[PDB]
Amino acid sequence: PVDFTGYWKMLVNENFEEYLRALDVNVALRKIANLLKPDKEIVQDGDHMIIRTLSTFRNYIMDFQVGKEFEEDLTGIDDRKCMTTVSWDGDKLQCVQKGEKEGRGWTQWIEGDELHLEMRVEGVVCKQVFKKVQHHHHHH
Numbered sequence: 213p214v215d216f217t218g219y220w221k222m223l224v225n226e227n228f229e230e231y232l233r234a235l236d237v238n239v240a241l242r243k244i245a246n247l248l249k250p251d252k253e254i255v256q257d258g259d260h261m262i263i264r265t266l267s268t269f270r271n272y273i274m275d276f277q278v279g280k281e282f283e284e285d286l287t288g289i290d291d292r293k294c295m296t297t298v299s300w301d302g303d304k305l306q307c308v309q310k311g312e313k314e315g316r317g318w319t320q321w322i323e324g325d326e327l328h329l330e331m332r333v334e335g336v337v338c339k340q341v342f343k344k345v346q347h348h349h350h351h352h
């Protein structure tokens with residue numbers, strides 16, 4: 213069965229600038245963010261999912277139950293609040309983020325040693341791929 217648990221290092225990050233612009237992330241933060249190559253530390257614990265998006269400058273932490281709508285605090289990205297639901301779709305994890313922006317959400321899946329993440333908002337698509345890695349680093 214699909215299990216996202218692991219430590220994952222960014223390999224590619226496609227169209228991130230336009231995704232951030234569509235979120236109205238401020239220009240100075242977009243400049244910082246485009247230099248970053250975040251890791252993902254994921255623990256899948258039953259249907260309790262923790263996805264830590266870790267970078268040298270700032271983190272974004274998700275901690276939620278699959279299937280259950282929750283208030284998602286996007287402080288550090290666009291500082292918005294969404295009413296967010298993450299659901300299994302076969303071997304894919306689907307996320308809908310209800311809020312100010314239309315069409316906001318993402319899909320996550322695994323191909324071999326790769327974690328694939330398609331992020332969407334306002335018809336814009338950013339695609340990230342990470343490689344599963346084994347050398348760990350301490351974090352908060």
Ligand SMILES: CC1=C(/C=C/C(C)=C/C=C/C(C)=C/CN)C(C)(C)CCC1
Binds near residue numbers: 250
């Ligand atoms: C814009 C910005 C950032 C953007 C983070 C983003 C979009 C995280 C998306 C997380 C998702 C869908 C995770 C599901 N694997 C960092 C990495 C927190 C650094 C500070 C500035």
